[PDB]
Design a protein around this ligand. Sequence first.
Ligand SMILES: Nc1ccn([C@@H]2O[C@H](CO)[C@@H](O)[C@H]2O)c(=O)n1
Ligand SMILES: [Zn+2]
Ligand SMILES: [Zn+2]
Lengths: 188, 180
Amino acid sequence: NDALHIGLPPFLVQANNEPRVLAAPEARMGYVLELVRANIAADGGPFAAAVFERDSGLLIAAGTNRVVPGRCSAAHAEILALSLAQAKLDTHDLSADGLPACELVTSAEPCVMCFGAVIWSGVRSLVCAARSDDVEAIGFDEGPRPENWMGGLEARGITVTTGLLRDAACALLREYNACNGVIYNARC
Amino acid sequence: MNDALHIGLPPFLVQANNEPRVLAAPEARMGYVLELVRANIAADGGPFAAAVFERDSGLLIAAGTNRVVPGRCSAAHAEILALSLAQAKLDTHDLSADGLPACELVTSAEPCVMCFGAVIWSGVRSLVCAARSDDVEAIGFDEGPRPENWMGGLEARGITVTTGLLRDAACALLREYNAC
Ligand SMILES: Nc1ccn([C@@H]2O[C@H](CO)[C@@H](O)[C@H]2O)c(=O)n1
Ligand SMILES: [Zn+2]
Ligand SMILES: [Zn+2]
């Protein structure tokens, strides 16, 4: 109660502690989707994200949705990934002098809150898997984002790419929803 | 710290989140939030503060301030901290959980797009702002690309919005921050 403290589950600490370099976009997203599955198993939401150095593929920090277990509605994957990267690099601005250009790789297009977080973070690129329609058509609300939000990011100098490994990302979302119920199911 | 995400709070804010406070009148609530603004500036933070109160009684639940630079966290806006600390105190991610008294976010200035979203997901049923978006822009702070008619967006989701409460007092503090 004397500070904002969002604990990270073991698999996420593991992810943030082990050096990892993933050059290809598919490799980066593949890893982020692995975190989605691991997070679901760790009582978290079906969302994950990670900040990588854009030009080297070095993983800086990863985050996942810890809203329920962390008793914090702001604990979205993007918020955690961006904040943990900033804490590690010791700056609130990921585009600060001397720092490498950063990229946020996310399992799904950001909700309105994370959309804003991306703009303030300093990352220079956003790479998404599942599309907004995918998540919303599955019961996930992205919230009221501004018109042509992608264009807005582009105007902020933030490059946007979406649909990367979309099929696998959507499969994981539907898999989560298939088990998102109170009635026990051994398959879950 | 390494593992978890840990945003430390300055002395005045730790105190604000532990001392009993019941402020019935909206102006009393905002007056207190503005006091946190000045204290935050003295504590190397941005000129913004916010607090979550029980809407009817005025019982203070939690307070937050802009700790972006000293906390090395761009998401550490006043609103994010206030809503998050309130959720931690009430043991839930949803401030609208059945049984909980209606909550209200009293903030020193209209929210940026990130905090606009945070308010929506928080469970608060009311938002009360002092300084207007234009006042914030007037000292170099960006509200970001918020959707058209953001206030209507909140009202459409069951969140009442009040703006301009003690606006001039809030602006006096914003201008002072800019000058110094
Ligand atoms: N892009 C998105 C979309 C949704 N969510 C999460 O799933 C819940 C319902 O949409 C939301 O409450 C939130 O936990 C998310 O983290 N990120
Ligand atoms: Zn989000
Ligand atoms: Zn904000």
